[PDB]
Design a protein around this nucleic acid. Structure first.
Ligand SMILES: [Mg+2]
Ligand SMILES: [Mg+2]
Ligand SMILES: [Mg+2]
Ligand SMILES: [Mg+2]
Ligand SMILES: [Zn+2]
Length: 171
RNA sequence: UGCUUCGGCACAACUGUUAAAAUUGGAAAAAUACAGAGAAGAUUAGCAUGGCCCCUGCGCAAGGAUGACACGCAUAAAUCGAGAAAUGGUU
């Protein structure tokens, strides 16, 4: 709603508008899915992956292609279209494909750790090498571990890039 | 992803009461049927006491049949010796 009320969005918003609205429609239907037959912990996995992909479109255009304006990006952050903290993180060295801000909240975890998905899949034991995080669904968002430019999510074949992530592009 | 003597460095570092379960057991209630109320004649107000009895209540109130219970039904032997007499052994 926040973007839709009153005000105008800066120049550029017409390029990203349909994609952003598609991502918002996908999140709208993820919230509405049914949860019978899947773990309690996996409720929000699709929401987290979709939130990642949405902010990764905003990130892709703002910092990897740099086709987004500083004022448009600052608008998206201010109007809550972009997760500003998560995109800010992806800029930090070592947090380049971080799956969620939950994964590196350390009060979030029993032993005061980050989550096991932040740990390079090699340095982990076979027990923590195929299990997705219970909150985010990420198996490995350690930079270096990423398939297709993103994390290794619950179902990421360690197939083809097109079958494993949303591929916006500019047709 | 920076930095790169382009060799590689740097950064980043261990989620999960792990189930979409499986058992697993214990529970209040319902009906049924039982049976179904203090004090001394009857009818009745209560306030207590005691505690491995609780319930309602925010309760250091108040209430729950004086909340209940107990409460004795004491077959709680609370028990026995004094002396004369008299009889039994022994001399
Ligand atoms: Mg009383
Ligand atoms: Mg009372
Ligand atoms: Mg009365
Ligand atoms: Mg009483
Ligand atoms: Zn992760």
């Amino acid at each position: 709603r926040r973007k839709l009320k009153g005000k105008k969005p800066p120049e550029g918003w017409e390029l990203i508008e349909e994609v952003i609205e598609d991502f918002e429609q996908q999140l709208k239907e993820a919230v509405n899915e049914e949860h019978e037959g899947k773990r309690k912990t996996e409720l929000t996995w699709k929401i987290h992956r979709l939130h990642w992909e949405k902010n990764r479109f905003i990130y892709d255009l703002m910092y990897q292609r740099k086709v987004m304006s500083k004022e448009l990006f600052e608008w998206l952050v201010r109007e809550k279209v972009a997760d500003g903290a998560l995109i800010a993180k992806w800029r930090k060295p070592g947090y380049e494909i971080l799956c969620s801000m939950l994964a590196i909240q350390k009060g979030n975890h029993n032993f005061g750790t980050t989550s096991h998905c932040r740990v390079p899949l090699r340095a982990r034991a076979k027990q923590q090498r195929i299990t997705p995080d219970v909150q985010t669904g990420c198996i490995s968002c350690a930079s270096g571990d990423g398939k297709f430019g993103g994390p290794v999510w619950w179902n990421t074949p360690l197939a083809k890039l097109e079958e494993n992530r949303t591929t916006w592009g500019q047709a």
